[PDB]
Amino acid sequence: HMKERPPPVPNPDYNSLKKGSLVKNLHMTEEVIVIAKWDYTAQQDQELDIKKNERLWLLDDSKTWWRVRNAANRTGYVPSNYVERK
């Protein structure tokens, strides 16, 4: 009938149009950390692959999607629905 799994991404709004923007050039002061409730797979190039119980450095969490950084100094996007700070 139907497998047992959570709903899809919370309507992602990081890209849709053909023309890109890219305006990264601002300072940020904060020391927060989030925790991925489960593991996810990088659906796009802007998104990041998170693991279960995986923690990262919270960068900017304003919209449905939050941005964090791993120990690899890498930064990506992830659905706040699959993540939960502690």
How would the blueprint of this fold be written?
Blueprint: E1 32-36, E2 54-60, E3 65-69, E4 75-79
Antiparallel strand pairs: 1-2, 2-3, 3-4
PDB class: signaling protein complex
Keywords: Nck, CD3epsilon, T-cell receptor, SH3 domain, Immunology, Cytoplasm, SH2 domain, Signaling protein complex
Assembly: monomeric
Q: Could you please describe the fold and organization of this structure?
A:
This protein is mostly beta strands. The chain starts with 31 loop residues before the first strand and ends in a 7-residue tail after the last strand. It is built from no helices and 4 strands. It is found in: Cytoplasm; Endoplasmic reticulum. The modification N-acetylthreonine is found at residue 29. This is Cytoplasmic protein NCK2.
Describe the structure using short key phrases.
monomer, mainly beta, SH3 type barrels, four-stranded antiparallel sheet, 0% helix, globular, Cytoplasmic protein NCK2
How would you summarize this macromolecular structure in one to three sentences?
With 86 residues, the protein is mainly beta. The chain has no helices and four strands.
Question: What is the helix content?
Answer: under 10%
Number of domains: 1
Radius of gyration, in Å, reads: 14 Å
Strand order of the largest sheet: 1-2-3-4
Largest sheet: 4 strands, antiparallel
The outline comes out as globular
Distance between the termini: 35 Å
Please indicate the percent range of residues in DSSP E strands (runs of 2 or more).
25-35%
SS content category: mainly beta
Organism: Homo sapiens
Domain SH3: 29-86
Protein name: Cytoplasmic protein NCK2
Subcellular location: Cytoplasm; Endoplasmic reticulum
